[model samples]
Target chain A: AVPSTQTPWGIKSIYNDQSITKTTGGSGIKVAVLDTGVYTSHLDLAGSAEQCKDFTQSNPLVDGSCTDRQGHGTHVAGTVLAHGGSNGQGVYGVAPQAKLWAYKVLGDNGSGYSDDIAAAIRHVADEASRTGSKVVINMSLGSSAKDSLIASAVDYAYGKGVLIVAAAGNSGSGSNTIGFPGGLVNAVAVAALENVQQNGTYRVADFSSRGNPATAGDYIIQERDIEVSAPGASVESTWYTGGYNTISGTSMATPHVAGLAAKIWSANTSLSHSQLRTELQNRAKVYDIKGGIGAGTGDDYASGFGYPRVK
Target chain B: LKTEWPELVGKSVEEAKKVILQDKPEAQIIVLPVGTIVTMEYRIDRVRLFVDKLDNIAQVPRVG
Candidate 1:
């Protein structure tokens, strides 16, 4: 895994307190991670994750054994649902109760096609009924150009009311372009924010991709499109099996939003995906800094609506 | 013999304290209800059992 420059690598443990014990543990909820496969056997997610069909190879269903050979998927999965309070061993997750449906959209070397990405989305969208969930989908990976098939698949997920989250790329120049899915309407585009000097003062990372408030003449940006910013530069979470590792990239930042999506859904099961996304973005704390690599209000072209709050 | 069985009646403070510190008493024969009680009640002599209005702790099965 790539080393993140922001948060150090460690598990932030969450306690199984009275409130959690008494409530339903998002037990029936599911989120589809369109990434590398997850390390399902990791003690934290051992019982919570459900194996979905792995898009990387063939008809085989995904399981813990099929972890990210490239190290990206496991790292991303950790940020979303790494179990906490294993009596002082690992870190906590934002939506610890939510189960994940793994989909390896990228190949082993971490490169794949827009056509393949579209196919993956279409497959999941059609199989939504068998999953028994109006699955929330997150794509932390992206490419340079716009593709209609990919856009349509994203639209299909949104049309079905599944919250779709994508990443603004890590190309640091102040250009208003990031990548494919992130450029699509109704998809939440996330940028990276770095933790500088440990003062809790965050700056859009030099590598975070920038975006215009307008997406192809649609003044109505996905309320959460570039909806919220999360810790990206130097974030420390799960990595390969040896120990906890850190990674950098918009890839690292996207899962933080994915985790929040699940948390918001847990708090309000009846919330339409779009409405939940709007409220979550509304809660972001924005900043205004122009000519900045990240954008928007204290905003740069990169950091968008600002960072979100777990509370 | 009738008093050996637990009563649904509430106990007083001094009696409750004694219950906590005291080891549970030995079990005696108890009745099992089927439907209509033309029932069979038998004693498994020397077995330890306790009864309460809310719970039956002794009714557990062991697994291998």
Candidate 2:
């Protein structure tokens, strides 16, 4: 395996921060990225990628294949498990050896109905159960419209021992903006951080959503809606065009945690879902917020439990 | 004038800092429910001490 120092900065940053150099890429684990289908032809993911199912209809605008046309899914997939190029000259994800399954719910336009997303989650859960392989579902996409179907799907997956991670929407200006799945108490809702400082602190991106008050009927599982934070601003990862691109959002941060979760599971297959969650929370490095309108100190509403730390 | 600083719970900023600091301090970030105060001189990292409208430490909540 190529050394971590050879890995790209974005991937290396999280690896070094988490002290996961010795972790063999999530070799036996399966990570299902429910977004735009990954372009399997990409050199970084070619050998170990699988297109499990496609919920989106064929769009003529893009290639008829399930390969990503919107780019977001490919980017997210790359972050979850890209193994880099044949010569080790490209970026490596957190778990480069993990098996990647693409379950496309979003279309070429980067939009999907909540019902379709719920269906995809159910399908993923069933797949894991059928295959007898523990799967970590990464939902980098989210919507503000709270759907009961999606909520129930998340709960179902949780009950089945499938760990789901979602993005705390990019709407950071106001409160009560955490989108569905992310807002769902069962999922690990993640926020994004930008601008790392020399002192080991970072800036919570202005666009990352804050933990909002629960709706009239929503379940409140934790003290804050946003559970953890990660490097999300201007992240470099694989693009659908078979190259690299830099993108930003809670979308970027979600995969880092998902990949890390897969590694954690791979390392210790005996851990229960809640136990893994607690481990991730306890290992996070709490950063001190400088100046912002949101709550600061430990486990604040903005950066929950600080950024995820591998240790 | 009191040479020692009073407890922050019920004291105003001036009164609290007067005895709280052994030496003169520079600018700092003070977060309130209404707005945030940023001083140009120093960096407070992510630690923001929220002072109530009456300039008393109602309860120490971490604010950024």
Kindly report the docking quality category of candidate 2.
incorrect
Which pairs in model 2 have colliding backbones?
A: A288-B46, A289-B45, A289-B46, A290-B45, A290-B46, A292-B64, A296-B62, A296-B63, B5-B19
- Which stretches in model 2 have alpha-carbon errors above 4 Å? A1-6, A17-24, A58-65, A198-200, A213-220, A285-295, B1-64
Taking the tens digit of each residue's C-alpha lDDT, what string does model 1 give over A250-276? 776777777777877877778778888
Interface RMSD of each: 31.3, 15.0
TM-score for the A-chain in each candidate structure: 0.82, 0.87
Name the candidate that leads on DockQ: 2
lDDT of 2 by residue, A1-311 (tens): 23234344556666655443322478888888888778877787777664456776643122224568877888888788877667666567888888887877876756666666788788778877888887889988765445678889989888888988888766564665566678788898888777565334666776677786442112224523777777787777788887777778788889888998888888898887678877777666344343233536566566666666554
DockQ of 1: 0.00
Query: Which candidate has the top score in TM-score?
Result: 2
